[model samples]
Target: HWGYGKHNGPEHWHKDFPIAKGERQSPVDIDTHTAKYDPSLKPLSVSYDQATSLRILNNGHAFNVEFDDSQDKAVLKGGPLDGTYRLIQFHFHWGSLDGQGSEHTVDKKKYAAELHLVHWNTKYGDFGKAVQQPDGLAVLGIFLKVGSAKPGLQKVVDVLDSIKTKGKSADFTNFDPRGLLPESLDYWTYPGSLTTPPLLECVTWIVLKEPISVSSEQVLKFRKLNFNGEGEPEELMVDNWRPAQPLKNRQIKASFK
Candidate 1:
């Protein structure tokens, strides 16, 4: 199984998945000073139906809240996107310690964690088929900071105990993902691949500039989850984030000045 360990870590991923070393690799450092501010960029528009949220699953990689993408129950537009993108699932990446766990960084500074809301282009018909095309997906990334317990996030944390082991899942619904966003819709946009395997080069990365808050106690619950299955030896699920990839020659565009 591919994981964020010394043996099967990011450095060794290229051995099995050549795309891991591709030019459009994700989780890169966002140097805000160099990011070009484009006045023409439109504000992001997100609409999610609480009923669309289906269930939550711990896939041994991360805990993801899956959505019913069969229809446009939830969609994102504007902000560097060509068309409407339907919400599929949302997940997080964090570390054992709060100082440095986030996949994407700002000015070389790492955050406590990061949230990824995965969406697929509606034009492509479905996510499975969309993922193979160039303008297939758009991932909205929201950075997480250590502070007061976020009321919206507590709903997610409350279920961690039930799905503490890999492959464990529970019925999760009536959750509005919009409540998890920060005040500012300002963000940086770029072309990148999935931070994890297959590393598809089909994503338009829309990373929020401001971060949302999560209390220390809430963050600690994430570490308690194990990467291994129920019968396997307990291996802490911290530091699941990939390291920053090289920026290369790609340009990052900002939605605001």
Candidate 2:
């Protein structure tokens, strides 16, 4: 029932989801000056098996490429995490215009888009139980700049037509998500919550300092998608990103000085 509309958007979320006013909310603007350098933080370790990609679907909110997480074939570890987090799904958030689309920003600057790779801590058993724990989920946030076309992103973009409407699903296999990452893993880590509702405050956010490149036209392709399903009035799936939440008293730590 919640969306990026004026009536049911982020601001209205707190009405139904009281946690929206919680302290550990996510997608905060990274005030570069306030971020501290941490010598103890290790470089993030991400290992993926191409075969883990299962399918791509439009969930009305965002289009996600699901992964086979029955095993630890694709896992993210190191950095701020104490244990391994199994990859479950990856999705993107974009805007109607090329000027802004990303959820998290740097020093108040927004990127063209943002990619969220959602993972769950294996120590907590499954994703269901994991989301409940304070350290249950680890979401890797990659900023997407409007520049050159990302060859890796084109693979997923190619299937946008197959799932033009909400609730649409199609086979999407053998896609390596690591290709979507920037060369440097240097990131700002913080304790936060999901950008979307239930807005559970259980995420250890690892937001990369560097941004991946995508063409203006490439991101525009995402706008063709609809928030409504077949037979419903079309609502273009653009500007489906949450604005920066209050940082409160949380500290953002950088892996590099």
Candidate 3:
């Protein structure tokens, strides 16, 4: 069963995945240094393609989509990124209970949760190979606050019945991940490492300044995850996120007009 409570959570993840110790963790405070007010950096038009290729895999801590690369789309231009990249896996980080939930920190305030959309360079061979290259990964971070509930997330909850148990998941045919992104894509971009083990420093992070919303109840369900590996009935994988790490002189930049 997943050992979720306080100390048993992400803080303890490094024990199993030792490389997690060097991962460039998030939820860091967005200071004036990282924030750039560029009027032209605003998000261009966004679209949600009807995806019939959605498949959720229970990856121990959360359900990650295997076909996210071709299923969903996120168009971003005029920002730090010059071209567009398809939306990939959408997973989350939450607190063991309620009060604190995100993985990326902003100015020291931790939100209820944070969703990550992992993308890869289409210029590369594919998702699998790109993950190994220096410029292979590009991730978008969207924070979630515990406030007025957001209906956009209803699709996720609607499918919970299929993933109710640990390691259990179902294929979400024709599902649109676009429903999960925050309204604003105006973000801070930086070169960082993965927050998980084998913390490869091959990622360009685009962390949205704004956050979405989720209900308190839904937040609690995430806290009940079992980390013993997906599908194991006994291990409770509650709270499987990593703590934020110091930027270590890394300079994070935003788009400019």
Candidate 4:
């Protein structure tokens, strides 16, 4: 029953899940000047079939678009990864205000929001098993800025009204995730854990340097979501992002100069 509330938030997570205090926790501040450039890093290769998109749901935490990962119909490769990672689900993290919602910050500058495309290595058989290994998951992080309206995001925004409450789900298909990415594949890579519990240290984070544009009106729509389900006092689903964690001894590798 963990949530981003004052009582059961990230700070109280360590009381139950010890790994929340682990060294490789995610949503770190990426100091661009300090990151090392690696020529060996290959360009990110992403192949996603729109037909593989199954459904969209509000899982109390955030709205996620699930995919049919039974096959490699949609997969991510290259860029610090040794093997193909199958697309599982994708979600977002935002705040109540327009300027401060992204989980990861760059040079201490916070963006309006952040998008996470979650994937798991096929070598581990399934997402459940893959999450237990060090080289298990690969999460692509895209920063969102409040600028021009993104027509590509209209498909996702249209469904928010139907799934505004927690545990509500609706059929969603034929949506391509590629449209949500930035023009450049340039990113910073590092070892990190899930922003939420159990906070497992099993992710190879690929954080894109460029940010996608979203209008101020579109940004406010995300705040309209409710964390609590029907019959309960409406609680605004904002600030659902975990704060930046310590970098410790880890080094961030960049794919571009």
TM-score of each: 0.98, 0.98, 0.80, 0.98
User: Against the hidden true structure, what lDDT does model 1 obtain?
Assistant: 0.92
List candidate 4 segments past 4 Å from native: none
**lDDT string, candidate 2, 39-89, tens digits:** 999889988753389899999899999999998889999998998999999
What is the lDDT of every predicted structure here? 0.92, 0.92, 0.64, 0.92
Q: Tens-digit lDDT track for model 4 on 58-123? A: 999999999999988889899999999999999999988877999999999999899999999999
**Residue range 1-257, candidate 1, lDDT tens digits:** 68999999889899889988788899899998999999988889888754378899999989999999888789999988989999999999998999988999999999999999999999989898988987899999999999988899899999999998999999998888988999988899999989999888999999999999999999999899999999999999999999999988799999987
lDDT of 4 at 15: 91
User: lDDT by residue for model 3 over 59-90, one digit each (tens)?
Assistant: 66676754445534443333555455555667
**Lowest-lDDT window of 10 residues in candidate 4?**
45-54
Global Cα lDDT for candidate 4: 0.92
Regions more than 4 Å wrong, model 2: none
Relative to the true structure, candidate 4 reaches a TM of 0.98
Task: After the best TM-score superposition of candidate 1, give how far the Cα of residue 69 lies from its true spot, in angstroms.
Answer: 0.9
- Inter-residue clash pairs, candidate 1: none
Q: Over the full model, what C-alpha lDDT does candidate 3 score relative to the true structure?
A: 0.64
> What C-alpha lDDT, on a 0 to 100 scale, does residue 128 get in candidate 3?
73
How does candidate 2 score on lDDT? Answer: 0.92
Q: Residue 137 of model 1: what lDDT?
A: 96
